[PDB]
Symmetry: D3
Subunit: 291 residues, 6 copies
């Protein structure tokens, strides 16, 4: 990284300035999962980027997933699953495991990585300070939508308390569990919870780290990768995409329709993807705006 | 509770007033473990008492343990232990389990119980916002003090950040894990961590919930239960007590010598023990002051 | 008070918690007169209860009367009265006496009693900082309503200045005198002034200390004492009650219709009546709500 | 006042500017008694001057007396006095009268006069919010100093609470009564209480309204009126002056020695004496500084 | 100024009080030019009056002109002018000169004069902190309105930033230059800029220092000088006045129609004209109100 | 700038993070002159870098020179100079010119350039709000140090007011003129004024833009350019350097000895020199630390 002439290091730094202005003082929600979360080099870069944002006076909020880690813990504990469609039923037992893996293991790693740069990160769920609630969701399994246990969608968000915590300079690292109106804690899909947090906080950008270059119109035609797309066009192509992309795309729609200026699907396999998507025009992600 | 004449309900309420004045605006650290934590009726009463304090403008801080729950999880996961003396060696594997049980299971239950009364509780470890650090401790096993893995004593405490969180009206529920100066997370004995938090925050009282009526000079002589005792006298009798009481008593000494006006050993088997110790002179606990 | 088992002292304390939550941070206006004001034991209990409220983060405002003390001072000064109906005409001379007795004697005693518990109470009239104004009221004497001198109803209240003084932690002790729009000070009936203060400050409760168990439908039928009643029903029975109860009931109507959630007529002959009405369900008072 | 050329109205206004700068944002304690308090034209001018100060961002504090009004009330009430030396013994009965006359009559008139210009004045004694305490004083009667009842000197002053009330824009009008360390209210000489308030608040000036042109070295030699004098010189001539001037001069000494930059003895028989002493060099008063 | 009896110095000071109340805490914009700006004695008096206002808790804002000083500098620099009608075309060269004379010479003198009394004045243009913008204005020259270069009218004003600077206790001294929406700096007529600042800041008064006794209906009939006039009447006589008075009168109309309670045309040849217009009823100026 | 692989744009951005942390919330004083100030491309880059810093929550303070522009204006005005040694005597006439060129021309250009990115810059001298004072300096001309008119060194700095203006988010652009203790304005060398501002504000870095690669031990030996040097070593080589470097080096010594962690001499001929010196390790400047 040293053979690079310094007059060019200068220019890439200077070229960040219009995005520094656009995001100064603003909320950016980042959904973090996939290989950016399981590879050690990408993890440390991700944590360093959160520290970066925060040392620019930008206000990151991290929502994390952890599907595979829950599955591994359930097998270690010998807890046999029930499955309707392709969905595990989350019994009270499974939720306790989900909660202790998400909040007590996965969240901790990111909190510690970020905090290597300063006292920034703090972990939380909807349970803490009543920051958000859940409502039980059913799923559609080849016809009759059905019940699959303590699985929810975000209900209400304590917008005021959340922004107080951010204005105080903290980086909330959110584990997606929250109580319903009766105090019963549900597990919430992390992609959609990111969308709901972004909308409630008036975020400027939703960033969705995913394990793909970006959105493909006609996968796997290479000459079909899009750079930008509107929600209306993104509605009419939703029924066509691979299973893995549906939650990430529904999140971007639910956010951008909800007033978030842009949602982005970026590649988490790229080192410092966040820095390149926010401060560079050479990003590989795809940007969703309204229309 | 209705056959009680109302002129007497009045008097017990009025008799709380001098302790309301003494504790208004003040920090009270409560170590919470034992049967007050495992029995459902005592749990709900404990949570309701934390809500009480907080609706009197008193500032509770809860430090919780969970030794037995860690042990059960380790057996469920089939993780065989190593033991020096009577101490389990906490390998990196054991700490990950300890942390996920303490923060992701035991802390969650108390947060949810308290939050049934309002948005008060928030869970945290030393990892969050760098609130406190640990330093590795060795243990003395019948002679040569020795190493037993990632087990620590509290090092430094971010007093300012902690009191900000309390002045904001929150009830921190602390899980005793914290990073050392190198970012490596240790498990801290909860009794001694309570003592260190109390001293750092300038608490007015340390409350230590324990499964005994109180301190016995000469157990099991009944006519030996003390009501109050000074630290100097409490130093010279320390080498004489049952194994279970040593950490609770060392905590009270380390706190009261450190400037906390009084530490109390109260019985957690009593419903609403906190209310009776703080707002009543008919408490069964034993109070430690300096001298 | 010591032969009472401690597990029962606990329960009556715990049973206060839902009213602590309901009133935390809220304004409670208390009209204080009668035998709770002239008996020494009831006085000290009343003052101690105001200190209690204030050490729970509740915000009491005390409005006091003093009819009989004015009369005694007038006789001591040999000032002969004029009477239309049953009403003394308050000449400029009588008002100067009323003001100096109410503010300079009766208010002082309560300020001093309360302040024995801390720097809480501060005395005031509408004259101070222009906190409220009066408008001259006429009275109805068996037909033609007529003039009886410098006697008023509360006009406007400086809501902002009043709540600043309360948020500062003070317990205003109000003597009901205020200037009209021309600077001429009037004496205001204390019961109705309490109602107007409660409505202006957005109080949660109006407490009216009176020398009776509570409201009787058909006095003196014992089996006619009510526990709760709505304003509409309380309008249609108003023309039926003893002379002494009319101002206390008109106050509760004017307050509850004005948005105060509940007004209460409680017995000031009961030691710590305030504590039992606020923090106990075994109260003897009668509660007025809208409907 | 109209035949005066306007170029000269201009100059006297401009000539106030260096005292506006000196006193902007500062505390001025004014002892107010005598004929400035009993003549209606001088009263209204005094009140208007307090409003003036306050509309210049200056912070007046008024301490008032009222000796003669107490005496008249005692005679109206037929309360016979006891006298040691020339001093009335203030029994509990006399104090109740003193307090109700000072706070409930004399203070009220000034509060109302000032408040004709805005919501500025608020009345208070040491009893309110524990603003100051008294300590019982004995007197020297031709030899053996002796006890004369509930008469005190100011003990401690709640400097913080007092300046909060002033920074809030209020003009405290102080009646000199305060409780001792046991809650027993004493009457304090107003001249000396003014001196103690001035010293406690870090006032810039003490103003002492008195019924004389100013200090005379050798009364009644006309060519003996002084314009300025230091405390050391003012100590050595104290044993020589008329009885009426001793309390006013002891006040100025106790204040200026206590750090108040200057104390002034001005003539309260002069309309707007305060304005002329503060904003004009043509004052008739006498100024005391240290040395 | 000493042969004046002191009882009369008192009365003129006391007679200022109702204007102190009216303007306490309020914004007063002062247009300053003409002989009050070029004569040394009038300059120092003007600066002293700004200090006066500020030491009364009044908030002056000074807008200054400087037409003749620009002309002299242009001749010193040998820059030949172009003239359409009677108007100099302000080329880029002329504006650089105008800006450096207005901000770098004329503004500096007033800043320094005022600051002799304290740290009050601070100089600024629309360029600083984007405090206001300009829009290019054309002029009407005996028919076809035409372009005369970089000359503007005030466009938008950063009301919030301006009042922050004033609430901080500063006296802004404004040089009328500001950028247009494209960053190109224009010179703004000072009289009309004063009117726009007054309206944007919600000033209580606009003061326009001019070199005349006041407005004459039928100049030069002496018996035609007016003391007060409404905007409607001031519209219909505008087409009749001398060239020099049109900008001063258009300013007063644009301000008073814009909600400023009164605009005043006062004589800047009078020492301390500001003090006499604000704090005296013997002013020679003419007051404009709406109607 | 597009043929650069994006994984490398990422790394140079990520490599800025440790200097973002070091300077977040801190003061950086930048002396700005020379060719970075006269070339249009370097000007716009400089202004953009100030906007950059400010959108990272860093607090730049710009001190500017302008020697050559003063000289040109003096010749345009035909003002003949007097010279002792190589120094122009600054008469009152020369200072008025210096002040109007520095504040009214050179400062304006930078204010406008920076403000193209937002409302950040505000121009000021020591005259404004009494922000700093000067003391007359003499010079040493081949022996006898002598007087050269109204030329000064910075005396006192209003540290509090200056940091208020910066905490408010403003970028002060300072023109080095200030009054002495008698109100007489002096011109201050900009290099040394930068050093004094840096020391007074507790800056983290002093940046000195100069027209050279950096400090040469033995100019013009190329193999003599230093990267870092301590003050003690920088004292003993000071008597050896070219005339142009002495003020820049004396500034760095006076700053670093005064507690500023590092002063830097960087090349203003390099586009975005500020960005490369602060956020890159490939800088060409030379850093001065204490020792
Ligand atoms: N709200 C909230 C919080 C939950 N955990 C925390 C740790 C430090 C500061 C704040 C919070
Ligand atoms: N407002 C008001 C007050 C009237 N008297 C007082 C005494 C202490 C504090 C505040 C006030
Ligand atoms: N806004 C603004 C300012 C422009 N110059 C200033 C000098 C001192 C304080 C504030 C400002």
């Amino acid at each position: 990284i040293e053979a690079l002439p310094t007059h060019i290091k200068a220019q890439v730094l200077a070229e960040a300035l219009p995005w520094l202005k656009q995001l100064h003082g603003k909320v950016v929600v980042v959904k973090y999962g996939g290989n950016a979360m399981t590879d050690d080099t990408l993890r440390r870069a991700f944590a360093a980027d959160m520290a970066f944002l925060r040392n620019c006076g930008i206000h990151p909020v991290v929502v994390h997933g952890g599907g595979p880690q829950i599955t591994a813990m359930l097998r270690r504990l010998g807890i046999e699953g029930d499955f309707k469609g392709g969905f595990r039923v989350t019994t009270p037992e499974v939720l306790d495991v989900a909660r202790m893996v998400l909040f007590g293991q996965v969240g901790r790693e990111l909190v510690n990585l970020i905090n290597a740069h300063g006292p920034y990160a703090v972990g939380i769920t909807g349970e803490d300070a009543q920051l958000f609630t859940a409502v039980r969701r059913s799923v559609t399994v080849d016809g009759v939508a059905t019940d699959i246990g303590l699985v929810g969608d975000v209900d209400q968000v304590n917008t005021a308390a959340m922004l107080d915590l951010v204005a105080a300079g903290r980086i909330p690292v959110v584990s997606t569990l929250a109580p319903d109106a009766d105090g019963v804690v549900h597990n919430i899909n992390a992609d959609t919870a990111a969308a709901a947090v972004a909308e409630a906080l008036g975020a400027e950008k939703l960033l969705m780290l995913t394990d793909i270059d970006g959105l493909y119109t006609r996968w796997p035609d290479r000459d079909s990768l899009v750079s930008e797309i509107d929600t209306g066009t993104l509605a009419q192509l939703l029924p066509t995409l691979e299973s893995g992309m549906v939650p990430k795309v529904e999140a971007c729609l639910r956010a951008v329709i909800g007033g978030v200026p842009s949602a982005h699907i970026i590649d988490g396999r790229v080192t410092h993807c966040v820095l390149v998507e926010l401060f560079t025009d050479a990003g590989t992600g795809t940007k969703v705006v309204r229309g």
